[PDB]
Write a protein that binds this ligand. Structure first.
Ligand SMILES: Cc1noc(C)c1-c1ccc2c(c1)ncn2Cc1ccc(Cl)cc1
Length: 113
């Protein structure tokens, strides 16, 4: 696929995540442990990812196959589930966003091939 054609296929899945409010709000920027007052974050999460980074990569054509994008999205979720406690707001927001993502990406992927 051409860069723009793949971007157009994937973009609605990313838009769906941004549309979730308040659940996407912690995910719209890189985690900033210094500002958040959580100095253990980068001792635990070695490969950070967030929506703004995925958006930039998508908009600049860096995703050359769908699994490359899907992998980044799951990285973002898996980092949040690793770091945050199960009872925390962010963990619960992560679970909601993952459910939204599955609902959006599965039909997209089913339509590639
Ligand atoms: C995502 C994520 N994964 O682990 C942590 C910590 C975060 C996190 C937690 C709070 C964050 C954040 C990122 N970026 C900004 N904030 C503050 C904030 C808290 C709740 C809402 Cl609704 C919006 C921003």
């Amino acid at each position: 696929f051409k860069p723009e054609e793949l971007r157009q296929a994937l973009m609605p899945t990313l838009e769906a995540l941004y549309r979730q409010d308040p659940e996407s709000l912690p995910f719209r920027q890189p985690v900033d442990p210094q500002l958040l007052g959580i100095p253990d974050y980068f001792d635990i999460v070695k490969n950070p990812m967030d929506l703004s980074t995925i958006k930039r990569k998508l908009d600049t054509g860096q995703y050359q196959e769908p699994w490359q994008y899907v992998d980044d999205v799951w990285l973002m979720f898996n980092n949040a589930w690793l770091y945050n406690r199960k009872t925390s707001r962010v963990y619960k927001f992560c679970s909601k966003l993952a459910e939204v993502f599955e609902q959006e990406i599965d039909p997209v992927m089913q339509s590639l091939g």
